[model samples]
Target: AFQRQHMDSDSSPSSSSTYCNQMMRRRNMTQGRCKPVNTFVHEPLVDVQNVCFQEKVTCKNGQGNCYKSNSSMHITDCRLTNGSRYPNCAYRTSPKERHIIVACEGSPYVPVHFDASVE
Candidate 1:
């Protein structure tokens, strides 16, 4: 359930001029507190969702609810910075393919191939 956001490998690095600052503040990634690290993905949504199928996975608090993408992808990394520019609000446009893993919530149960064997 990744994508709709941003990543690494199998993809090329592409960064918007105002990516660091624009998104940093635009997305409220730094609303109250300051985030020292962040990344912007540059790939299709299906690519990320297609490879994550480890239903018996461990999720956030150890509940087992995550998936992964195996391959490569692209992304832009926004490293640490104060709030000014490159020095403080840095940006790294790195493209890449990826081996990714993701999980979702709002569901009460999880099982392998659950979606694959539906009628």
Candidate 2:
């Protein structure tokens, strides 16, 4: 989830000539709020790597999901052909690991990889 905050100047210029100056000040403050924007969990699909799954992987609302791998499968390590401005594909390998839940924002889906094998 993402949120935006707005702030206004407490005082305006007292004089007519200062009206322009006050407006400029307000504009600057408003732009300042935009500077430190928050990054959403889900990003664009820049690349696909080390993809493996025992079952089918379903993507919802353009979001990708991964299941435990039944067989060994490895996608080639490569850069995103689509030129996505997001982080590289990654996954957890621990048995007691938790899935990384990403919030959707600029992009519709999150990039993930499965690194487990079946016994």
Candidate 3:
């Protein structure tokens, strides 16, 4: 004759410890990844033409995905000098021009408002 016995141990401690460690590591990694990179500037980029008072201008994120000013002024025409860097000036004919928001692309965040004026 054989007797069967059951052994019971609480798994909550181990599981909880693992979950906490993982959560901490994940949060740290996220914070690290979100840190901004250092930008190298070769020369002065912007060329202010007219002395007219300008409003806060928001332009669409271009090909380089660089950070631009919150707002700018209306210019007759702005030229881009450096090929590698983002353009110095943006163009907007009216206050209702459609702009593209492309800050969040790969992450879980959604694209923001794109209706900002160019000038």
Candidate 4:
């Protein structure tokens, strides 16, 4: 789950630029080893959680907890670079305009579990 407290979704250049770089380091996912396959949701948290009520999709993990966003929304995906070096954690940025797929806990507090991007 993304730290809603740290997600710089509302910003443009900085959030999309150094944002991932900063988040990677600030969250210590960059420490020791470079963490790959990250997604930044720049939309309202409420909107994301409510997506569960809109559509149902099969999860890549083969579960019923997955949902496909009814509409496309803001998102950023971080993948390991082709160079794939260590320490530098070099990454390539490919901002996407695709509908997102996320898993919902749908109980208790209704936490949204980010599954991954839609096919």
Considering every candidate listed, which one attains the maximal TM-score? 4
Instruction: Give per-residue CA lDDT, model 4, range 1-119, as digits (tens).
Output: 44442234564433236666666666666778888867777777677777777788888775757888998877777667677677888655556667878766745434356777765
For candidate 3, lDDT tens digit of each residue in 1-119? 00000001111222112332232223332233321111111111231211111223333444423223333422111122223222222111111212112222224322222222232
Clash number by candidate, in order = 33, 4, 3, 0
Candidate 1, which segments miss by more than 4 Å at Cα? 1-17, 54-63, 82-95, 107-119
Residue 10 miss distance in model 4 (angstroms):
1.9
Q: For each candidate in turn, give its C-alpha RMSD to the true structure in angstroms.
A: 8.3, 20.3, 25.1, 3.1
Model 2 pairs in collision:
41-103, 46-80, 54-69, 54-70
Comparing 1 with 4 on lDDT, the higher-scoring candidate is 4
TM-score of 1: 0.53
Score residue 65 of candidate 1 by CA lDDT.
Answer: 61
Query: How high a TM-score does candidate 3 get?
Result: 0.15
Q: Candidate 3: which stretches are off by over 4 Å?
A: 1-62, 77-119
lDDT by candidate, in order shown? 0.45, 0.25, 0.22, 0.67
Model 3, position 45, has a per-residue lDDT of 22
Arranged by TM-score with the best first, the candidates are 4, 1, 2, 3
Candidate 2, residue 67: lDDT: 43
**TM-score list, all predictions:** 0.53, 0.17, 0.15, 0.77
True-vs-predicted CA distance for residue 96, candidate 1, Å: 3.8
The candidate scoring highest on lDDT is: 4
Cα lDDT for residue 116, model 4? 75
lDDT of 4 at 23: 62
**Deviation from native of the Cα of residue 28 in model 2, angstroms:** 22
